[PDB]
Amino acid sequence: EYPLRDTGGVNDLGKKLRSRTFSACILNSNAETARDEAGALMDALDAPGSGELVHPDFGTVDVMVDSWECRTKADELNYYAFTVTVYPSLQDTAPDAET
Amino acid sequence: EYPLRDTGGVNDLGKKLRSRTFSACILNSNAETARDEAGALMDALDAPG
Amino acid sequence: DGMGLNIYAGDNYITGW
Amino acid sequence: DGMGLNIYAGDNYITGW
Amino acid sequence: DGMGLNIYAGDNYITGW
Amino acid sequence: ASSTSATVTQGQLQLTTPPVFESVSDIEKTTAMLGAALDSVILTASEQGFSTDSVQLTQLRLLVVADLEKRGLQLAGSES
Amino acid sequence: NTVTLRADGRLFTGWTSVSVTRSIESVAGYFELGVNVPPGTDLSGLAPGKKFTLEIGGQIVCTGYIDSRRRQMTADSMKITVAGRDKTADLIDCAAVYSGGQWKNRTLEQIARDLCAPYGVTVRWELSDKESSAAFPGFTLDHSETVYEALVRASRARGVLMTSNAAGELVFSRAASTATDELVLGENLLTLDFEEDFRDRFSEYTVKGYARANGAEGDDIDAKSIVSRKGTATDSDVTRYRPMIIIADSKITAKDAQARALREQRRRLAKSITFEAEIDGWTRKDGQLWMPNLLVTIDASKYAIKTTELLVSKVTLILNDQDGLKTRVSLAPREGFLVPVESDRGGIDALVEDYYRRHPEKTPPW
Amino acid sequence: NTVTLRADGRLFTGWTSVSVTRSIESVAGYFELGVNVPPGTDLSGLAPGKKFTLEIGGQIVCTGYIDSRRRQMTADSMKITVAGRDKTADLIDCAAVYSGGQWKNRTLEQIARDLCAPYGVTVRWELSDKESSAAFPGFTLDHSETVYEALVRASRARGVLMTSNAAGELVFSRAASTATDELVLGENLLTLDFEEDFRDRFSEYTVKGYARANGAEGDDIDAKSIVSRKGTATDSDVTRYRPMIIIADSKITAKDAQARALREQRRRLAKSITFEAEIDGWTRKDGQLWMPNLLVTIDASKYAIKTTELLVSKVTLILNDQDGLKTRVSLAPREGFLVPVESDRGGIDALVEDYYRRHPEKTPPW
Amino acid sequence: NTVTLRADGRLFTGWTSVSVTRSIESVAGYFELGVNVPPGTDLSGLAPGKKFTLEIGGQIVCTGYIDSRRRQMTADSMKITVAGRDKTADLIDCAAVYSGGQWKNRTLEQIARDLCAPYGVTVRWELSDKESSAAFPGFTLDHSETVYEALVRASRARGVLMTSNAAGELVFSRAASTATDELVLGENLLTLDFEEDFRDRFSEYTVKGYARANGAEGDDIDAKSIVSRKGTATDSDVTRYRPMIIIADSKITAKDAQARALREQRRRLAKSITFEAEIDGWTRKDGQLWMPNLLVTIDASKYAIKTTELLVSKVTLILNDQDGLKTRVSLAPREGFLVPVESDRGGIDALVEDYYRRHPEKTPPW
Amino acid sequence: RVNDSALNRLLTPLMRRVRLMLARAVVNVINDGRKVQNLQVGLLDDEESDEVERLQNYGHFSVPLPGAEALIACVGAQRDQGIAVVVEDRRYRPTNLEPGDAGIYHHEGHRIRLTKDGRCIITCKTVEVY
Amino acid sequence: RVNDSALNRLLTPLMRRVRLMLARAVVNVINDGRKVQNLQVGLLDDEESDEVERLQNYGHFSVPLPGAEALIACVGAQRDQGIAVVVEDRRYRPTNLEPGDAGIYHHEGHRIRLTKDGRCIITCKTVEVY
Amino acid sequence: SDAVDNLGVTQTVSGLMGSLSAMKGSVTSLINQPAMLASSLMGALSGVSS
Amino acid sequence: YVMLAAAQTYRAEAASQALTAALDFSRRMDNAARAPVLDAP
């Protein structure tokens, strides 16, 4: 935006990353298998590296987690809620050396 | 995100701390044992180490 | 610029020399 | 460092001397 | 003051002279 | 205008061109001629000045032809 | 329009932040780039001492050697940078080496070409003056003096200003003459800044020094005129008394005194009035990059500014993420970067010299 | 209480931000104002070189010449300022001009009046001492030395401190004697700052130099006493060894050495202990403005401070929007701005002089 | 692990913010503490001039005299601090006092012990060299020179570096030999910073000066060799020409020339490459505090860094509320703090000297 | 001391004193009544200096004529305490001598010269021993 | 001017100019054709200075031999305007004299010496009055 | 000495060889003084290692 | 005995240094997937 001028605009600059996110739930009829599955999900989300996310909406992608939650309510004995946000595992150098 | 280019870099440095939080309730029908338990839990919550 | 203005203004107490 | 870089670069107009 | 304290403290490597 | 105003380019900097290198078919002919001549030189060198000369000349031929093809004809966004 | 760094061996194209600087008030142009790579990869093509050549698009801006490379990483961030200057900056911090410290009868170009020989820098002389090429009756070198110090000492007395070319050469530059571009407040300006301070500009600069008496002139010059030398340059912009006296730098005659007095007055004029603008594009209106020593027409009349023509003095190109493509162009009056012979707009010799000075592209008779 | 700037021709009343500074540790008082006008209006009454007179309410604070004027405009803001100093600041950057560089037998007031004649500054001498008026046996001027440099060099040897008046004159100021105002922590203080650092104050300052032998004294002085001169001044606030040796500035005698040694000790005392306060009103308790050289009584006893009387050293008046009306007053001990003759609280001559020193409003016998 | 400040009379244990500094590139270690007390209490025990001894846990870090104490209070907040340096800092700002300026035939340790006698600082000499103990054929003292200036000049001439001990003494320190600690990127690093600039490192340093001709040597030395002296030290890290010429500091022989030329090269090497790290614990791995002059093994391979051993150059301990317990440790190559005799890893005398140099804990023959 | 001009203002006086320490001068008036010769010298331009002492070695004396060129060496870089070490009179100097010579002189002949092969020439007009 | 190295770069030239004001030199060539003696001196190392004028007091003259040690005193701290004030020849100097003496010599004897008890000794080979 | 001579086929070992020759020549002096003998021997070993 | 023990100690230190050199040689090589390039020194 210029001073004392009306016609303005914007200039393009690349494209920001695709920040995917989803909400998941772990529930059973045993209240112990549910806890075991929730623990497995915790320890698999909190792992070093990038893993094959499979989602009915996203598809098959390779992402690295950024955050997650595990909410229960002390009244629902089987329910465990999760909310995850993931970023694509795009690892490319800046200088991009050539010959 | 690298300017004037589509691609961007993402790198991992360790793992964040687990910020576990919970809520609790302490009630007793004596209406004085409830106060005693609440005070004991306050003292056990504010302590070194 | 607290010291950068004390140079342009006078200084009856010499900084150097 | 606006002036701290002008020392390392040239200065055809001498700062002192 | 990062440099302003190095003057009040010693400097076994001289800054000038 | 002084020389500080103008930005120098690589050709002038290395100077401190034969017309054959202007068009496309002439570039193709020149590359073919250089490749054939250097290949003949390598084959002949394989009998006098046996080994090191040939091993160096083959890589020189590869580098020269690669430079000419990658910079003269294989330009970015060339269509027919 | 990609910035390629021709380091030793291979090209490097993508960057995270670019900042290049160029000016005629300096003997070098520094560049600083920001690189981002996965932790653990090899960064050996960008090391101190490598031979670099910055190429913006298809044109070369700087050439020389890499100076510094910073690498840091904290609990939540990672930053790597790289720096460097021209090959002309090799003279700034390197001590001048010559066998006989004294040049008897040499000109400034010859002295510079004899001093910048061991390093590799090439001297370029652009002025076509008849008095700027006047040889030194004697020029000695203080020991442990850098090439930059020696050449600046000589150029100050000659009135010339020394600069670095865009190809790493040394240049004794000449100010431009034709207005090539236009900067206006309404069309192509994002930010202006006009400072007009009179804390340094005086009225009468008078330079005093000692005459020449070493050798041949010692049998001619008398005792009093050895010590009694003087030169004057008067300014009309300051109306009160405001004088200034300058002790000379070397052996001084009357014409040499007038020359330096004028050099000092014009340098003060250039340093007083300053214009700064932030345009949107790296490229010019014609299409080339923005570089120093360009005469432009300023039309900031909506802000009640009465300046009409200025000469650019500093150009810095930026590629920050928050900025985009910007270039902060700084401007100063042309009359501050002139040689004492020329002026801003008594015989046949004078008429011919005036013609060949008005038309610089013509070949002088010499 | 409007700040009117009497420029060349007409008055200017409304301002957006005002900042005025005054001190006795300086030879000028600078001001900076902010002006806001529609883009395109003519701003020519506020130009560099114009003769300005700042007038707060109905009283003049500064008078002199305008120095700088900045104008900037970005995509969402617009800022214009103006600056200036006194007419005494004309001496600071101007080179002293006199015909014969040497004054044989003159006093400091006469030297200053002969040096400040071409410019227009009027010299004012307030000290009634008998030793501060002692004539110089000889005083020469280094060529290309500013009037400020020469007068400061002389005043340092004399022990006097040089300042600028509120009407543009030069003043050889005298410290105040009567406690006029009161500053307490409970009533009229918004912010205090008490710094007490002992990184510079020493125990024994001793000055050494060369005696006088040029001419008439050369037929009397011997060889050893020419080089052997000394003066001492001891401080009782530093209980360790902590000495200091000072090479003199000019030809020295014993009494002159003692005077400089104290001058140095008292300047160190003044620079060591510093008080700073932010009061609410520009005006004083009586009603006049706040100005330097005033003896105030400090009652900051709720903060366990044991200082009782101080002397104002710097007053800066502010009219920012976020500030309102403020004046940051800085304070230093009085014993740091005295002449070596006087002291902070052997014959008939001594008694009479004491009486006429305790009562300054009386006329001395001279 | 409590920081007790033994002031004059009693202990002081609790603090609000603590910052201590120590280095071998300096002659003192400064500290700064913050004290919060009810407004109106007495803070006499913390006054300028008191004799303080800082004690971290059960160990003493600094000892000397208190320098400054700041007290400020506004409408919202209130802050009191206190500062101080070592007793070795008593020499930095105090002028050296000796009866006869010239020392005829003395060594550096004897000169230092004669100069630091009036103050109270004790000199400690750690080097076991045979050439660093070579006596000065003559050493004069510029009048009004501080003890710091004189001893630093002498130490620069000898190649030794001077430093302040942790007990307040002067020390002519010796660089460490055995790798005692390990700093890795994955285990015990919160933040690293690796700067590697080449704007100062040259290829060939060469020093020139004047020979010795005063007195006994004046009957022997000829005319030309008085003026013709030279010394050279070449660096192999800069591959371009890059020379440097140094005009010497005192009377100079060939061996002395090379000594300073090397000292200069090693100081530039130390000042060029710099590592900085923020570890979590004040204490070391064994348990003692972090102090300068320690040889650590760097294993920052994850960030592609090829340095293996470094020497700590500066340690600053912090106790801020936002920080916790931190100590910012700075590292420089060991080869920059060596004497010109030793090197980083022609007869029987050479073999014995090599053995007793490899094994420093042994007693030399002397 | 952040701006270029501020740094110039801060650093100028030291260089001015350095540049003004040593100086040349001309001699206009010589006073010999004092125990040390008092010259009246003329510095760079529009600058005089009265009562400037001249220093000469023990055992030698000479009274230069007006117009001689002196080397004024200011003591402690003050432009005061100016002392004249040498006063040369280039208009009256003996020229074209043998490689090894030494002798007194006067501004019209009068040479007591010591020449190569052991010759103590005494060229005067009326020599008077006493 | 925040960094140590930047401050060193800013402050070095002034100290270099200070340190290169007073200097020693060796005389290699003496030219006497000019009205002032022109020496060809040699400074610290790999540095020569041609046509350096020598200043001597009025009434005295002498032509030193090559190899004498001169004290070059640069004017205005420039390494130009070099002026030689004193040129000693330590190889040919009279030694072991009485407390109060004053004379003139030559590089092989030839002493016009003034001795304590009123003795004007004139030791030469062939003295020729004129 | 044999070890150093085997080393010296590629490098320059003349200084160490001369030092060893001097040590061999001055054996009778070293036998009487024990400290110098051991110090010189370890210095020679370190010289070989260098 | 002293000569023998000293020789053996230097031999052991040399062996450790040789291991360090070998591991540095192994570390020199990269491990990231990179496309090949024509080499010309």
- Interface test with chain M among L7, L37, L39, L45, by most M beta carbons within 10 Å: L45
Q: Does the CB of K2 have a partner CB in chain E at under 8 Å?
A: yes
Q: Does the CB of F2 have a partner CB in chain G at under 8 Å?
A: yes
Residue type, L6: N
Q: Are strands I123-125 and I170-172 parallel, antiparallel or unpaired?
A: parallel
Look at the block and give the residue holding tokens 């140079």: C7
The string of DSSP codes covering H306-340 is ---EEEEEEEEEE--TTT-SEEEEEEE-GGGS--T
Burial I216-245 (b: 16+ CB within 10 A, else e): eeeeeeebeebbbbbbebebeebeeebbbb
Q: How far apart are CA M21 and CA M16, in angstroms?
A: 9
| 3-class DSSP state of G259 | helix
* Ramachandran category for residue G58: left, alpha or beta (phi over 0 → left; psi -120 to 50 → alpha): alpha
Whether the CB-CB separation of H85 and H64 falls below 8 Å is answered with yes
Whether the CB-CB separation of L18 and L6 falls below 8 Å is answered with no
Q: How far apart are CA H56 and CA H166, in angstroms?
A: 12
Phi/psi for L37 (5° steps) reads -60, -50
Contacts of G343-348 spanning 24+ positions with Cβ under 8 A: none
Look at the block and give the residue holding tokens 């604070």: H61
Q: Do the two chains K and G touch, given a threshold of 8 Å on CB pairs and at least 3 pairs?
A: yes
Q: What was the elucidation method?
A: cryo-EM
Residue J43, C-beta contacts closer than 8 angstroms, at least 6 positions apart:
G227, H101, H143, J23, J25, J49, J72
CA angle (G10, G16, G18) in 5-degree steps: 80
Q: Which residues of E touch K6 (CB under 8 A)?
A: none
The token duo for I217 is: 């040597």
Phi/psi for I363 (5° steps) reads -90, 125
Q: How far apart are CA I297 and CA I316, in angstroms?
A: 19
Whether the CB-CB separation of G303 and G124 falls below 8 Å is answered with no
Domain boundaries, chain H: 1-86+175-196+272-338, 87-174, 197-271
Contact criterion met (CB < 8 Å) for J44 and H143: yes
The token duo for L24 is: 């061999």
- Residue D8 Cα to chain centre, angstroms: 6
Burial degree of A20 (CB within 10 A; 0-12, 13-18, 19+)? middle
Nearest residue of J to residue D2 by CA position?
A: J2
Q: How far apart are CA H4 and CA H56, in angstroms?
A: 6
Nearest residue of A to residue G38 by CA position?
A: A93
| 3-class DSSP state of J24 | strand
Instruction: Give, in order, the Cα–Cα distances in Å from H221 to each of H228, I161, J35.
Output: 11, 47, 11
Whether the CB-CB separation of G356 and G366 falls below 8 Å is answered with no
Q: How far apart are CA A64 and CA A85, in angstroms?
A: 9
The token duo for I51 is: 């004799």
| 3-class DSSP state of A73 | coil
Q: Does the CB of A10 have a partner CB in chain H at under 8 Å?
A: no
Q: Which residues of M touch F69 (CB under 8 A)?
A: none
Residue B31, C-beta contacts closer than 8 angstroms, at least 6 positions apart:
none
Nearest residue of A to residue H73 by CA position?
A: A3
Q: Which residues of K touch G247 (CB under 8 A)?
A: 76
Residue I92 CB neighbours (<10 A)? 23
The token duo for J93 is: 């100097």
| 3-class DSSP state of L22 | helix
If DSSP states are collapsed to H, E and C, what string results for chain I? CCEEEECCCCCCCCCCEEEEEEECCCCCCCEEEEECCCCCCCCCCCCCCCEEEEEECCEEEEEEECCEEEEEECCCCEEEEEEECCCHHHCCCCECCCCCCCECCECHHHHHHHHCCCCCCCEEECCCCCCCCCCECCECCCCCCEHHHHHHHHHHHHCCCEEECCCCCEEECCCCCCEEEEEECCCCCCCEEEEEECCCCCCEEEEECCCCCCHHHHHCCCCHHHHCCCEEEECCCCCCCCEEEEECCCCCCHHHHHHHHHHHHHHHHHHHEEEEEEECCCECCCCCECCCCCEEEEECCCCCCCCCEEEEEEEEEECCCCCCCEEEEEEECHHHCCCCCCCCCCCHHHHHHHHHHHCCCCCCCC
Burial degree of A37 (CB within 10 A; 0-12, 13-18, 19+)? middle
The token duo for I190 is: 């919160």
Q: Which residues of G touch K72 (CB under 8 A)?
A: none
Q: How far apart are CA A42 and CA A64, in angstroms?
A: 14
- Residue M4 Cα to chain centre, angstroms: 26
If DSSP states are collapsed to H, E and C, what string results for chain F? CCCCCCCCEHHHHHHCCCHHHCCCHHHHHHHHHHHHHHHHHHHHHCCCCCCHHHHHHHHHHHHHHHHHHHHHHCCCCCCC
Q: C-contacting residues of J 14-43, CB under 8 Å? A: 14, 17
What's the start-to-end Cα distance of chain C, in Å? 22
Burial degree of A7 (CB within 10 A; 0-12, 13-18, 19+)? exposed
Instruction: Give, in order, the Cα–Cα distances in Å from M4 to each of G29, I177, I282, M8, M9.
Output: 64, 26, 45, 6, 9
Q: G-contacting residues of J 107-126, CB under 8 Å? A: none
Contact criterion met (CB < 8 Å) for J90 and K14: no
Q: Which residues of G touch A1 (CB under 8 A)?
A: 190
β-pair partners for H60? H55
CATH class of the domain at H197-271: alpha beta
Instruction: Please give the order of strands across the beta sheet that includes H243-247.
Output: H231-234, H204-208, H243-247
Contact criterion met (CB < 8 Å) for I161 and E12: yes
Q: How many CB pairs under 8 A join C and J?
A: 19
Whether the CB-CB separation of H297 and H312 falls below 8 Å is answered with no
Residue type, B11: N
Whether the CB-CB separation of H27 and H295 falls below 8 Å is answered with no
If DSSP states are collapsed to H, E and C, what string results for B1-49? CCCCCCCCCCCCCCCCCCCCCCCCCCCCCCCCHHHHHHHHHHHHHCCCC
Residue A30 CB neighbours (<10 A)? 11
Q: How far apart are CA I31 and CA I8, in angstroms?
A: 17
Look at the block and give the residue holding tokens 């893993």: A51
Burial degree of H344 (CB within 10 A; 0-12, 13-18, 19+)? exposed
The token duo for I58 is: 């059960």
Q: Do the two chains I and G touch, given a threshold of 8 Å on CB pairs and at least 3 pairs?
A: yes
Q: How far apart are CA H103 and CA J27, in angstroms?
A: 19
The string of DSSP codes covering chain M is -HHHHHHHHHHHHHHHHHHHHHHHHHHHS--S---------
Q: How far apart are CA I309 and CA G235, in angstroms?
A: 63
Question: Resolution limit in angstroms?
Answer: 3.3
> Which of I100, I96, I102 minimizes the C-alpha distance to I145?
I96
The dihedral formed by the CA atoms of L2, L7, L9 and L14, expressed in degrees to the nearest 10: -80
Nearest residue of J to residue C14 by CA position?
A: J10
Burial degree of H187 (CB within 10 A; 0-12, 13-18, 19+)? exposed
Contact criterion met (CB < 8 Å) for G187 and A5: yes
- Residue I70 Cα to chain centre, angstroms: 29
> Which of I268, I206, I203 minimizes the C-alpha distance to I242?
I203
Residue G284 CA neighbour count, 13 Å, CB half: 18
The string of DSSP codes covering H230-295 is -EEEE-SS--S--EEEEE-SSS--HHHHHHHHHHHHHHHHHHHEEEEEEES-SB-SSSSBP-SS-E
What is the number of H-type helices and E-type strands within chain J? 1, 8
Give the CATH fold of the H1-86+175-196+272-338 domain.
Phage tail proteins - horseshoe like beta roll fold (2.30.300)
- Residue G42 Cα to chain centre, angstroms: 38
Q: Does the CB of M38 have a partner CB in chain F at under 8 Å?
A: yes
Residue K13, C-beta contacts closer than 8 angstroms, at least 6 positions apart:
D16, D17, G149
The token duo for G113 is: 């070409």
Q: Which residues of E touch K16 (CB under 8 A)?
A: none
> Which of K17, K90, K88, K18 minimizes the C-alpha distance to K54?
K88
Nearest residue of J to residue G246 by CA position?
A: J16
- Peptide-bond breaks in chain F following residues (C–N over 2.5 A): 16
> Which of F8, D12, D7 minimizes the C-alpha distance to G169?
F8
Question: Please, where are the H alpha helices in C1-17?
Answer: 2-8
> Which of H76, G301, H38 minimizes the C-alpha distance to A3?
H76
- Interface test with chain K among G140, G148, G226, by most K beta carbons within 10 Å: G140
Residue I160 CA neighbour count, 13 Å, CB half: 28
Question: Largest Cα–Cα distance in chain B?
Answer: 71
- Residue I219 Cα to chain centre, angstroms: 40
| 3-class DSSP state of K28 | strand
Residue F50, C-beta contacts closer than 8 angstroms, at least 6 positions apart:
none
Q: Do the two chains K and J touch, given a threshold of 8 Å on CB pairs and at least 3 pairs?
A: yes
Q: What is the CATH number of domain I87-174?
A: 3.55.50.10
Q: How far apart are CA J72 and CA J75, in angstroms?
A: 9
The token duo for J40 is: 């009246």
Under DSSP, the state recorded for K11 is: H
Contact criterion met (CB < 8 Å) for I226 and K69: yes
Q: How far apart are CA B31 and CA A38, in angstroms?
A: 38
